[PDB]
């Protein structure tokens, strides 16, 4: 093990001007070797995804990022106030292939069912990572990738329940936020599939806590970047109700919605609570302009309540997030440099 | 977008001295910087790349080091081969270069020869006079020409033209073409092309009267 | 060892397009990209863009509603496009391979291409006699000279007394004039002494107008 | 064992250092291992406790290696051992709100009784003492009475109660027409 400042790959467009390829036409390269990864035959490496100094670093690169790329209007930090101009600009994030410099290598676990914590005993040796967006996100992940097998959950601790369960689906589910055009949004979730993928979810749950009855809730509450699913779309600040996602009962039924396809209720805030450091900021108004985008639901992640006193009648989970680490994790938990 | 300024723009050395060049950036870029040596009518060669890693093949008289917006390329002793243009690249961004450094050789400081040359009668003919000022073997290559038509200091209508080293004396040669018509010529008198050098103790004026 | 040849037209007209191929010999295109770098007269170098064998390229921002770079891995070679070409286009376009990370220094690089956009038409040259005189007289050393004056396009030859005087000539570089024409002064200093004993007479040559001149300097 | 006494309706904050002077991850538990409050990241998160609507931290003081647990509206079933998990260590507070009311809330005449009512917990047996306006002391136990009151009793009565060497205050108006 060890740990050296590692680079980066992308196939940013120095012709575009959006904040993802500027910066990583001026702080990355096209790379790549080739052709595949040298397999190594009959040898176990011992992984943790939970203390990987690759996600450190590249939760700086993401931070040192928004710092030149959304300009705020208002940025509110320690009884600090600063003031400055916020032109609009478009955001969409850059698959980034971190790389290893000379001397060093990179250990890549095949397994596709691994916990991101433990023995490997089918690894490899790569130059770079693949494909990872800066997606920054509470409670869905989005754009990320899919698991080659079943669905895979994962904690650093599945018994402390102040841990976060970073989840992993094998099928994306596709998920439609849309600006008309008052400034109001809304999302779309096909139903019947959202169904069957919270269905996943829990047969997975009630095999890691040995026999319980399955139950998602609403966020328990907090600030509205974690009570709601928060993303970026376009440069704007989205926070869409999740409280119809969230709110079903496995074992044996128990409420279930329809209406075709899923609608939850959105809105675009200008003064949002930084997630880099403590502190708050202000932006410009709506774009007068209409905002489509289409995402794809390929991680989720959640919290468990549960604990107490005299035995179980059943398991409580709730959207969680915040902590943007998390949503790195979820992608370089078969990485090791 | 981020700047490439070298300094000096213009060295003058003498075969086995000690040079160093620099190359200051607007903005921090770590270690991607390259150097390229340049020869008139040539296209550029790798010298040093990853700001301080040296190409295969270069010499161990060509060095490197900096970080972040300053930078410098030594060569420990300089020989008649490296004397030439060299070029500060951005290895990514934009990839934009410096307006690089020329090295020359260096010799004894000599006074230019100071000559003009009034346009020809058959020249005046098709409507154009094109009156010529030469400064012939001279060092330095910097150099001042001023055009006076009656006294009055001329702008925007002249051109100058420097040749090459000379591979012997190792002197240059400067000429100023001041273009005028054939009405805007025939309304004046004199004619004078003060030059002002380092060799001479004062500006040489040459003036002739149509 | 690999080598980087060019070729296409160089004397190219305004609104025209550019078009050059930069052909490999020793290496095959695969696993390394293929850019190109023009410098315009006396400038700094400039990255156009480069392609990758996938075909995904990567123009420069102020030049990719015009530039276009293509691979033909048939041939081991690949080409240049350039849409609406202007005075502002005028420059020695290069070729050069792009390695992988963390090599990334172009090379090797191409022996460059010159390329003029200029809308003036062929015409022959006009030589103009720069007779010596005693006003001239620097210490015996008289100066005189031929003037090469409107031609295009470049370049043209000069000689003196066929080759014969070669001592003390000065051809200065061609200059561009506000007419589109291009302008040359050859001066050659000689004895003073010499002047009433010995000829000389400039050679200048313009095939592009298969136009020689052979004219005598006779002081004043 | 660090013991904190709050009032019934006051605000409590309890204190949670963290070692070094920076912004981390901690989270506030009771007893019963009850997520009450934490964080993650930079965002603020409350536990599915009876407290949720009454809690919150001061975020301005993340940065400087803070991460207090504030309680607004104090009850008596709050009274609880709560536990704050920071940098993998544990420390440990333990909550006792306890409260004293009157024997009336009307206005009562010189010479007339005064009984006062220690609310306590099981499992504590705490000590009051309170002054009146003019300087009368009284002490003892879960109950305290006064014989009579005097004119100069009218005003504001200050009750002191000691438990686990720690005291919290307790401020009573009394009305003694004349
Ligand atoms: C935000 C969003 O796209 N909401 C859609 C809405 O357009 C559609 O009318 C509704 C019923 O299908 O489904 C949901
Ligand atoms: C995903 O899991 C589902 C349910 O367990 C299974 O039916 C399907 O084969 C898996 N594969 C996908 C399509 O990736
Ligand atoms: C979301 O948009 C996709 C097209 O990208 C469409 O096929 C799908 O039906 C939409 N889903 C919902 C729930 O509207
Ligand atoms: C989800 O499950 C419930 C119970 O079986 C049902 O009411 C609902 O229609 C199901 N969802 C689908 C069809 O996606
Ligand atoms: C979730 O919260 C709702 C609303 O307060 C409540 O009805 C429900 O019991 C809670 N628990 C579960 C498992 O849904
Ligand atoms: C997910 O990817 C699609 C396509 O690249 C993009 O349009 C969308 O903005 C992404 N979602 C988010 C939240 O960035
Ligand atoms: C989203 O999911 C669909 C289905 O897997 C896929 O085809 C698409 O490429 C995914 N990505 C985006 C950005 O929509
Ligand atoms: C490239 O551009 C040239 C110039 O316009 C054009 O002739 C040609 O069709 C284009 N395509 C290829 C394959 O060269």
Known sequence: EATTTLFCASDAKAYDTEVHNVWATHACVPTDPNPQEVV???????????????????????????????????????????????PKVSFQPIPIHYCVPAGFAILKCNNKTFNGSGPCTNVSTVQCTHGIRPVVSTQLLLNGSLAEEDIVIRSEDFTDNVKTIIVQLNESVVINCTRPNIRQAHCNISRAKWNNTLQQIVIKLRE????????????????????????????????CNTAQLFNSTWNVTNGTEGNDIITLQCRIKQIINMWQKVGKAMYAPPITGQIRCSSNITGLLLTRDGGNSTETETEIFRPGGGDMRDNWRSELYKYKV | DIQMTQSPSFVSASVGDRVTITCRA?????????????????????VIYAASTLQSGVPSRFSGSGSGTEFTLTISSLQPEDFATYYCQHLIGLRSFGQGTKLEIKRTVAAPSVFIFPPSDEQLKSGTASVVCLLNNFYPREAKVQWKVDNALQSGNSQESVTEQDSKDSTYSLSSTLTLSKADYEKHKVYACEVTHQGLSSPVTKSFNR | ?????????????????????????????????????????????????????????????????????????????????????????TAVYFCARRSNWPYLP???????????????????????????????????????????????PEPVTVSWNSGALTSGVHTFPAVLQSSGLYSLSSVVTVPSSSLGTQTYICNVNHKPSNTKVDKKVEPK | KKVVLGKKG????????????????????????????????????????????????????????????????????????????????????????????????????????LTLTLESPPGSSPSVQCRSPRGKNIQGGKTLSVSQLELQDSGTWTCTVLQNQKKVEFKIDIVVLA
């Open chain 3, 1 to 89: 060892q690999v080598q980087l040849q060019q070729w296409g037209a160089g004397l190219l007209k305004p609104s025209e397009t550019l078009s050059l191929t930069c052909g490999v010999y020793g290496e095959s295109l695969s696993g390394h990209y293929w850019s190109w770098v023009r410098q315009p007269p006396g400038k700094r170098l400039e990255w156009i863009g480069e392609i990758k064998h996938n075909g995904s390229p990567n123009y420069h921002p102020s030049l990719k509603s015009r530039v276009t770079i293509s691979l033909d891995m048939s041939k081991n070679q690949f080409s240049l496009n350039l849409t609406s070409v202007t005075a502002a286009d």
């Open chain 2, 26 to 46: 607007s903005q921090g870029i770590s270690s991607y910087l390259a150097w390229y040596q340049q020869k008139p009518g040539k296209a550029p060669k790798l």
């Open chain 3, 106 to 152: 172009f090379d090797p690089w191409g022996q460059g291409t010159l390329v003029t956009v200029s809308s003036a038409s062929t015409k022959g040259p006009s030589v103009f006699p720069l007779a010596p005189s005693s006003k001239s007289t620097s210490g015996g050393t008289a100066a005189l000279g031929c003037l090469v004056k409107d031609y295009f």
């Open chain 4, 10 to 113: 006051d605000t409590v904050e309890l204190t949670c250092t963290a070692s070094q002077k920076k912004s981390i991850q901690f989270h506030w538990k009771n007893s019963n291992q009850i997520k009450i409050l934490g964080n993650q990241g930079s965002f603020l998160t409350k536990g599915p406790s009876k407290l949720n609507d009454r809690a919150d931290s001061r975020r301005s003081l993340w940065d400087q290696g803070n991460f207090p647990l504030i309680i607004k509206n104090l009850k008596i079933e709050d009274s609880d051992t709560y536990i704050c998990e920071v940098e993998d260590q544990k420390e440990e507070v333990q909550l006792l709100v306890f409260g004293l009311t009157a024997n009336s809330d009307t206005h009562l005449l010189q010479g007339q009784s």
């Open chain 1, 208 to 239: 890691k806590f040995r026999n319980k009855t399955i139950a998602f809730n609403q966020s328990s509450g907090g600030d509205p970047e974690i009570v709601m699913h928060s993303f970026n779309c376009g440069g704007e600040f989205f926070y």
């Open chain 1, 40 to 86: 190594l035959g009959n040898v176990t490496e011992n992984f943790n995804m939970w203390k990987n100094n690759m996600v450190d670093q590249m939760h700086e690169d993401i931070i040192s990022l928004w710092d030149e790329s959304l300009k705020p209007c208002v940025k509110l930090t320690g009884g600090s106030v600063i003031t400055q101009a916020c």
